[PDB]
Symmetry: C3
Subunit: 176 residues, 3 copies
C-alpha cells in the first residue's frame, strides 16, 4: 500500500530523521520543484513530429530536477546523507540557451504554439519554485548548486519556448 | 452581476460573518483546493475513448473537493454553520489505489501520456494545497477529515496516473 | 546572453534600484501575475475554429497583465518611475461579463471543454495571484488599480469559461 497514513495529521518525513510539518519551508521547496517536474512531463507529452527534437533534453531536465528535489530534502548538517553538482548541467543549459537564442528572430509575451506556451508556463513555475528555494535558503543552509541550476533553468525555458515557436513557424507574441 | 466590487480593496467574506483579507491562510487554503479542482476539470477534459473509464471518478473527485472547500471556509467555532466526512470518500480512494496498484507493472518520474502527465500534475497541486491546508491547521481549528482526504488524494493521483499510462500502452517514466 | 548570473545567489532587481530577495512579497506578486500570463497564453493556444472569437480579448488580457506586472515591480515612493489605470480595462471586462452572462443558460464546478476547463484554471490562478497581490499591499503601497483589475479578471474567466462551454454545445458541470 502506497498510503501509510503517517501523513494524515499534516506531518511528514524528509531525508534523514526530522519529522517536519508539510508547510515547513523545506517541504514546500521540495514540493514546488516536484510540481515543476510534473509540468515538464506534461509539456513533454505535447511534443509531436515537428517538435520531436526537444524530447530528450526535457526528459533529461526531469532527471536533474529529481536530484534537485533530493538535495532540497537533505539538511546540510545531516551526517548520514548532497548529490547535485551544478557545473555540467548548467553549462549544458547554457549551450542550449545560446543555440536557441541565435536560431530565433519588443518584450515577448508568453504564448504561441501549445508546446511553446507550455514551455512558457514551465518558465514561470520554475521561477515560483526558485522563490520558494530562496525562502528555504534564508532559514537553512541549502545546496547552492540547486539554486544556480534553477535560476538558469527558467532562462532555458524562455529560450526553448521561443524555439518551439520557431519550430512550428509561429511568431513570438509581442508586447504592443 | 457576478462582480459585487466588495473585493476590490483586497477583502472578502467566508462562511459566516468574518471579513478576511484575501491572503489570510484560510482564504489561501480554500483557494488552493479550488485550483486543484480547476485542474481536475482540466485533466478530465483530456479523456478520450481509451481513458473513458477514468471519467466518473474524476467527476466525483470534483464534488468531493467542493465539499472540502466549503469546510475549509467554515470556522470550527462558528455557531450557525462542517459537511465533509472522510470515511467513505477515503476508503473509496483506497480501493482505487489498490486496484490500480496491482494492474500496473526505479523511482517514477511524472509524465507519459498527456492524461497521465496531467494526473501527475494533479498529484503535485493536491500536495501544494495540502501544505496550505496544514498551514491553516497550525493557526486555526479545521476539519481534520479534509486533511485526511487530501493526503490520500495525491496518492490516488499517482495511482491513476500510472494506470492512465497503462491504459494507453505507455511505460512509466523512470529515474535513470 | 540572457543569463547574467546576477540571480544565482537568490537576489534580483526590480523597477528602480532596490536589490530584493526572490522570495520578497513584491517579487512573488510580480511572479504570480507572470504565471497567470503564461497560463493565458497556454489557454489561448487551445482555441480552435469553434472558439476563435475568444482569441483577441485573451491576447488583449496578456497585454494588460504585462502592465500589471510592471506596476507591481514599481515601488510607490520611487522618484524616477505607475502606468496601469483600471477604468477602461475593467469596464471592458464588465461588458464581456454581462455579455457572456446573459448568453449562457446549482453551483458550477470547473470543467467542460478543454478551453472551458483552461479558462476555469485561469480563474483560480488569477485568484492565487490576487492573494499574493494583497499580501504585498499589506506591507507596501501598491497601485490599487492593479488589484481592482485582477479581482474583476477572475470574474471574467468564470464568465468566458461558461461561454467557452456554450460555444461548443457543452453543459456546465454542476455541483450534485
Ligand atoms: N503535501 C506535501 N507537499 C510536498 N511534499 C510532501 C507533501 N507530503 C509529503 N511530502 C514529501 O514527500 C514524501 C513522500 O510523500 P508521502 O505523501 O508518501 O508522505 P506522507 O504524506 O507523510 O505519508 P502518507 O501519504 O503515506 O500518509 C514525504 O516523505 C515528504 O518528504
Ligand atoms: N483571491 C481569492 N482567492 C481565493 N479565494 C477567494 C479570493 N477572493 C475571494 N475568494 C473567496 O471566494 C468567494 C467568492 O469570490 P468573489 O471573487 O465573488 O469574492 P470577492 O472578490 O470578495 O467579491 P467580488 O469579486 O464580487 O468583488 C469569496 O466570498 C471568498 O471567500
Ligand atoms: N524567481 C523569480 N520569480 C519571480 N520574478 C523574478 C524571479 N527572478 C527574477 N525575477 C524578476 O524578473 C526580472 C528578470 O528575471 P531574471 O531571471 O533575468 O533575473 P535574475 O534571475 O536576477 O538574473 P539572471 O537570471 O540573469 O541571473 C528580474 O529583474 C526580477 O525582477
Ligand atoms: Mg503516500
Ligand atoms: Mg533568473
Ligand atoms: Mg465576484
Ligand atoms: Mg501524503
Ligand atoms: Mg536571466
Ligand atoms: Mg473577487
Amino acid at each position: 500500500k502506497i498510503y501509510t497514513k503517517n501523513g494524515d495529521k499534516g506531518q511528514t518525513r524528509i531525508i534523514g530523521k526530522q519529522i517536519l510539518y508539510k508547510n515547513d519551508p523545506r517541504v514546500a521547496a521540495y514540493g514546488e520543484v516536484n510540481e515543476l517536474n510534473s509540468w515538464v512531463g506534461y509539456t513533454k507529452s505535447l511534443i509531436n513530429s515537428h517538435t520531436q527534437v526537444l524530447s530528450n533534453e526535457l526528459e533529461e531536465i526531469q532527471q536533474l530536477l529529481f536530484d534537485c528535489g533530493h538535495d532540497l530534502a537533505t539538511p546540510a548538517d545531516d551526517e548520514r546523507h548532497f548529490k547535485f553538482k551544478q557545473e555540467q548541467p548548467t553549462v549544458w543549459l547554457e549551450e542550449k540557451i545560446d543555440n536557441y537564442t541565435q536560431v530565433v528572430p519588443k518584450f515577448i509575451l508568453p504564448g504561441g504554439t501549445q508546446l511553446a506556451s507550455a514551455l512558457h508556463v514551465a518558465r514561470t513555475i520554475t521561477r515560483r519554485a526558485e522563490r520558494q528555494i530562496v525562502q528555504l535558503m534564508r532559514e537553512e543552509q541549502i545546496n547552492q548548486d540547486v539554486l544556480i541550476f534553477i535560476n538558469r533553468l527558467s532562462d532555458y525555458f524562455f529560450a526553448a519556448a521561443r524555439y518551439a515557436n520557431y519550430l512550428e513557424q509561429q511568431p513570438d507574441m509581442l508586447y504592443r
